[PDB]
Amino acid sequence: TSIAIGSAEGFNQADKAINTAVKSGRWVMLKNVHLAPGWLMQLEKKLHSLQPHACFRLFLTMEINPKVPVNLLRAGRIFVFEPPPGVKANMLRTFSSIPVSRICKSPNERARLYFLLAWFHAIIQERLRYAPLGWSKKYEFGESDLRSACDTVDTWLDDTAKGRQNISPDKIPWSALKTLMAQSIYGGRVDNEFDQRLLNTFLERLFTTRSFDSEFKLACKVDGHKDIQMPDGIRREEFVQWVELLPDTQTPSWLGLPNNAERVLLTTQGVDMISKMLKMQ
Amino acid sequence: KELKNIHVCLGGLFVPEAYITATRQYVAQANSWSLEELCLEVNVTTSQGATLDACSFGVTGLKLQGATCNNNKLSLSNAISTALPLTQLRWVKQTNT
Amino acid sequence: DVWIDVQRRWVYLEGIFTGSADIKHLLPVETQRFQSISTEFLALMKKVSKSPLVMDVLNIQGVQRSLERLADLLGKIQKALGEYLERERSSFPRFYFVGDEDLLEIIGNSKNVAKLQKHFKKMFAGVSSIILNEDNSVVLGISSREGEEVMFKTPVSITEHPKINEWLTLVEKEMRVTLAKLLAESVTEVEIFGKATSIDPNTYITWIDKYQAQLVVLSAQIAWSENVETALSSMGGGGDAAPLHSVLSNVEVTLNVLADSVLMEQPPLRRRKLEHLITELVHQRDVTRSLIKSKIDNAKSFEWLSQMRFYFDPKQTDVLQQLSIQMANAKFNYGFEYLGVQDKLVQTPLTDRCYLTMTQALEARLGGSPFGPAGTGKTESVKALGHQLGRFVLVFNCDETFDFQAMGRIFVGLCQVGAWGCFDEFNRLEERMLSAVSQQVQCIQEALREHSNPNYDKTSAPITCELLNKQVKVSPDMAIFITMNPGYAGRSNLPDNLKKLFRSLAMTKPDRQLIAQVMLYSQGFRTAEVLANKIVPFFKLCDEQLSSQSHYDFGLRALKSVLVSAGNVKRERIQKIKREKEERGEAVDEGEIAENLPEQEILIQSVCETMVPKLVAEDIPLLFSLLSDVFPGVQYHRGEMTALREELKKVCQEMYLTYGDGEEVGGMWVEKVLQLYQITQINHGLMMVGPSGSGKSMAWRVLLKALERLEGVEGVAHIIDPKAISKDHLYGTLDPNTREWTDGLFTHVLRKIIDSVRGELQKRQWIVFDGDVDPEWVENLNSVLDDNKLLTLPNGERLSLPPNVRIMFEVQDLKYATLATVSRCGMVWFSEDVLSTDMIFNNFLARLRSIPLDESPMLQIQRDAATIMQPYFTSNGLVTKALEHAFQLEHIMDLTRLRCLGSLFSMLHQACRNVAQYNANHPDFPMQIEQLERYIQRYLVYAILWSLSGDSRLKMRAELGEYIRRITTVPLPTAPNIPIIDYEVSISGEWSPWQAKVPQIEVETHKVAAPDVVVPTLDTVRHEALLYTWLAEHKPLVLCGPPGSGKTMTLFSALRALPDMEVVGLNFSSATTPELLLKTFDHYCEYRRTPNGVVLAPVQLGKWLVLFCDEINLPDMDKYGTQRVISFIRQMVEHGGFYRTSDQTWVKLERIQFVGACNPPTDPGRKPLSHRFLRHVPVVYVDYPGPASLTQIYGTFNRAMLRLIPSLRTYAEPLTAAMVEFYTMSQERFTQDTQPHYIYSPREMTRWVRGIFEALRPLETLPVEGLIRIWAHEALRLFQDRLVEDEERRWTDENIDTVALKHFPNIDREKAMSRPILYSNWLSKDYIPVDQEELRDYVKARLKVFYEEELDVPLVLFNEVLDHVLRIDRIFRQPQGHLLLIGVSGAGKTTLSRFVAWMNGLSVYQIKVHRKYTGEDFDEDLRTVLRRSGCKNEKIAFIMDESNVLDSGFLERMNTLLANGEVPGLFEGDEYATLMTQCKEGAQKEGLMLDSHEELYKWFTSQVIRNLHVVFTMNPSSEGLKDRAATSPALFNRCVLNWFGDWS
């Protein structure tokens, strides 16, 4: 039972759902509980004096803001959700989120398109860490955009390949996918001419027939002369294994950025780590 | 007359876009052109070694991020920012080519 | 608790049943049940009314059981009626858009269909009314608001379908069917019009006229879609010769025909159809050109699939399914909703991106969220897309009152009808409410997704979702759209779970050059591309170059207003040319007229008529240079409105205003009036922005009168102060329990205009908002002041703005409004230079020469005085130069021209009244011209001095006097050093010093330092005269100065000379609202309904009421810089009344005036007063009396005091000197910088004299050392008790010793300065000094007795405890003596207070605060305390702790109680009657026979003042003390602060 906090009817529904689930064993999630800090005290008190079913679970989704009670934080287990820390981690999360049966479908090129989409999403989100340079403003490139792009890829691949086991890379609707991702899915958030220019550059570079060649370069000159190579596999397992064997040497050049973009940020983060270690000596 | 030949720092002006509009308006009035049919072209030269014509205005303090300007041609660089010594803003008629 | 409910239920059920006479035919069984209930009600009516006594009717058996049975029956029938209403709404779901009472009216008036015509507008997109035969029995067709109509293929017969729901459903179905058939025929014809090398114009115009504006554009789009599809199919072979060029050529020739059509004159409907077709075909031509350039040869190419394509299949039987609309992979069926005639949007590269994104969202079964800045086409693009698919699009202007329930009802309506919901300004909801609404949105979207599955069949269970604990059928046609202006003020942040339910789209840069090119092209502008290429860069350069002002807007709302004005100007000029050709010649060739037409001149005229009025003085040359550069050579000269100028001349003459032409005096103001007239012509939403006193109100009033006399249309103005009332009272409230909507002020006014019961639609109605603008209240008017012209309420009601109504705002700045409000209104900028000072002088002199002051010899005196004052009231005159100099001095308040001018004018009116009084006192010898001249000149100088420097200190007054002496020629006093400010003007016409009015008096020994005693001082005699002058004119005024300066003493001394004025004390705090003033009005005034309106006047006839506001600048400013109470008072002073929110009735004040007092606005917690409020209130600065004045005031008090002991007669002067010196050093040493409560004023000097007098009164004799001991004891108690640090106490003690030995050298130091200076009347009868050990023994014995009868907590006695109990006992023995004990908890404050109260015979009352304690409980405890102390004459020590303050209302009530001794709003209703009875018996017991309520309440207030003592204990917080210094200002000037602190 999913309940969104904020209204009195919401509190009544939450109380009823919790009272029913602690006996029946259902799950209950209350969303945006940070909007009712006063009610969180009562919820914690209610939970403490309780012996619920073995399978009962209570999920409380909230934004990270100081209004959340300390006692509720201590009483429950905290799970911080945030952008994945790097291209490799982002692509691993993307491949874990999408079900296996969806990627492995009638056209064998669907797995390659999903891999290209995962790489594009990882590159797009990782540039956000460099706010003035990677983009012009902190856009909210999130899971909704990735799901919409996956839906678009599925729909247009199904339309172009009527159940055929194989479709030619030229026959793939590249223009449809690029235009939709630059106009509706990812380009909707973009309100800048130059950010739109950058998004179009990335989409025309990644989503093309040449991406199915064996010599395709996902990112050129990532460090000196070395460059990222497109996987030559055709199955989801091959792409996932390529992601897992990615080097742990990510630099801004993977994103197309100069390698000096992270110097100031890394220095500030190191100083902040020193200050945090000293703060709790 | 002297206000045309002084190199301004666009970062030191309260409204630099008003300065760009004022220079455009000066060029349009001087040559009896129309404002809407004027385009801008930029020529980066040395501050001392430069000549300002009737349509060129000098601007200082412009910093180029992630690129270098040599002979008015751009090249990528690993420097965070490269200073442009003197930027000349020339207003010319639109060509639509 | 049952009779009232049953009575109400029967009343409204009887109203429903009787009003709807046809409800019985369709609700039979409950009609019979209510018939029986009505018979029972009639039996009750005939039984209970026979005996009009409660006892006579409760003794009758069978009444309560029958009452319960009737309650159950009424509840059951109400539930049955509600269930019937829901069931009837299930069929024909369009009833979800009308109210419950509206639905009942529809039910009861099914027989007569004339009443049904006013409800079709809100149940249909464009159906204004239905078309009926003469019999009114068959529905022929429907009509739009523009008059356009569609005739049904098969008319719907009401006789064959008598039930309302059945024939309404048939009407809707037949609407859809007939639109489908008409579209089929129109498509068949336009297909012939297609694939043609040439088009006959006559046939094309015939086809355009035949069909509706919707269907012609739809058919054109269809035919073009099949043409392009066929051409691409031909090219699908690969390499085939392109027939797409043929499609482009066909589009171009049809566009040529349409463009030639718009030059010549057309009927307005056919003109609008031509404009729509021009826009559509321009879009089609652009798309075809793009297809040709891209070399598209496949119909499956995305360059064609991305476009919107129409596929018409008339063969299919279903009405919705003949036409299919497809964009990319999204497929929609045309809804065939009659949309009337809408305004079409140029489809630009952003309305094409918006269409694509929103259709992709729709195909994903989740909403769309176009976002961006203001004026980007977000709402209009959503509406245009909805109209493109033929959907019913409902626009809602969201605000914080759109709670979970209101949004739930709206969603239920949209789900059942199958309509699109555009929720604009959606982030204006509360964040919690957005979070709650996300659940409903998610449920609806899940219902849509489960509907979309192929497994679902329409023959299976209908698709439903849980909305508001009910299963609601979800139509697949539903859509939800939200448009948000992110980062704007007054907007909330959407929860992240809500944002994933919408597909956002940034709409930030509309393609303005295309909208202008297409808009000018469709209006008949030859060379529209050149005009667009000039006008869009012009707006960009205006935005870049012009200065940044809060009211500037150069966006698409400005282009669109400029382009519309350009079209109107072109039409007007064509008509003028036709008339001129009629005057000279006969040949009227429209082609030649259009050929030789100055279109650039027309565009410049529109720009000047729309953009120039808002420009500030320094920006006008910039915009005119931009115009002369963008449009070189083209010049425009404004056409004179000669008739309007004449009519304005007459209005200004009758209103005593100055009129001018061009560069004449008043020319700028008349130009501004004409600009306001033009902006009124082009805009339906208006703002008059400009500094206070710039002429805005006079501008629009004169314009309204001139328009009434010029056009013959009566002008009605409704002026509303939007911020003087709560937004709930401004727009209305929806009851959370019964869902009952109560109209606000603006809502009631607009609904009254729309109803037009008294012909309000035939009059020019202007709704003026004269007040501050913030995004909280003004953004509810976003749908009103837009192109929707609609007010949407949370209860689902929508009120269309009539075309004769103008919404006008008269503001002084727009610094808090967002760009969403600024962009929707036409600005007129009134600089202060518009209203020159000469114009104000002329207005004053005209009113003086015309309007008599008494209500004629008085008018003759006024005319003579005006003739005398004329030379000085000229430009570059004495008054002008003095005002210019006065602006260079520094005043206690921000000086404004009109405040000084109003003060001066009122003072001159008082001079005229003085001359009239002199004439009345000398009937034999009236004042001659020479004496009048001398008096008027000298009084003019005196009034200039007191009006231009009254609110400034002595130095600035002297400077202004010196400047006036330098510049003037009026005779002035010849004294070499005495300033002119120290002189008055005798009625004989000569300067006389104020010191002649200051006599050295001898106060009676029993009136020493009494509250009503004022030693005459030069400043007192001057300020009293000034206050008399301002009060006698009933002018509002403000006294400013340090606390204790003597502002209230001066006001009460001046009011003593005015016997017909009664003052009422109001103490404002930071939580003050207009509710305090309203309670004062309820207590002291009464409302009477005169034939002219409702009038609020004091209860006592013939007496003027003065509302004295003690701290007028304390009330908190909201986050938008507005004090609501100050706005309320400014409304009551400007317009002479206010709005009663009970029934939205304008109440006019009578015999009520306002006087304010305040500390300087630079003091902590004090806010500067508004310039619009300060314009009407003169300010007088009352400063602290200086050492000479202090020596004079307290020297008289000490001389009066020391007459008690004749042996001490010689010590008055040194005693007063010591008092003044120590007070001065204490004031210099301890300032408010250190601690907030370190405020020292002459009030302490008075408490000093009073304390020494009370300690000296009973003694028969006393040595000098005893006098010094009393002096030092009072000095310690007044200057050392409030000190925090021990260093301050040590300094105070040492300097007390120093001063005492300095001014009294030959005294015994030890016998007078023995450090434990203790005085007590506990051991003896008198207040003689007490020793520490005997006092300790006495306190020990009394503490033993205290333990025996009261609290048994043992206490340890140390010297500080003895000091503290003596200090508390001092306060408990004084009238209105309140304590403020500050110290750490557990220090003994409450116990010592209780113990001392026990000694003094004071009852201890403490409020029992708990978790459920609220405001009403505190009010009841206050009522109990007040009744005990006042009515029963009981001495009570009201001990209250800061922890008991659970709300700011407690502190507000305690502030009023502590200051006044009575809370005006505490006793109201039956409680007031009981209190008044008890006061009657109490006064009888005391021995006073009082009858009237006024004198009883005065006695009650005096008793509460004498008896009630309030002890307030708090911890010594740093910021808490500062907070309380503003939340409860009476805690620091009515209480006696004692700093206990921690134990040393």
Ligand SMILES: Nc1ncnc2c1ncn2[C@@H]1O[C@H](COP(=O)(O)OP(=O)(O)OP(=O)(O)O)[C@@H](O)[C@H]1O
């Ligand atoms: N044309 C005029 N000639 C002479 N006096 C005028 C004229 N117009 C206004 N006044 C007077 O000058 C003063 C300006 O007040 P007005 O009501 O016009 O200002 P306002 O713009 O409404 O200012 P506020 O914002 O304080 O209401 C008033 O005393 C008004 O009567």
Ligand SMILES: Nc1ncnc2c1ncn2[C@@H]1O[C@H](COP(=O)(O)OP(=O)(O)O)[C@@H](O)[C@H]1O
């Ligand atoms: N001429 C005077 N005669 C008598 N008292 C005076 C005089 N001038 C000042 N005072 C004293 O100044 C104080 C002013 O108190 P109040 O009228 O409440 O001032 P405010 O309204 O400025 O707070 C009183 O103690 C009053 O007795």
Ligand SMILES: Nc1ncnc2c1ncn2[C@@H]1O[C@H](COP(=O)(O)OP(=O)(O)O)[C@@H](O)[C@H]1O
């Ligand atoms: N001089 C004292 N001797 C003994 N107990 C004291 C003394 N002063 C305070 N107390 C203690 O203070 C407590 C009561 O607190 P109270 O005086 O009501 O607090 P507050 O000073 O905050 O108003 C009792 O326990 C009492 O014994």
Ligand SMILES: [Mg+2]
């Ligand atoms: Mg909008």
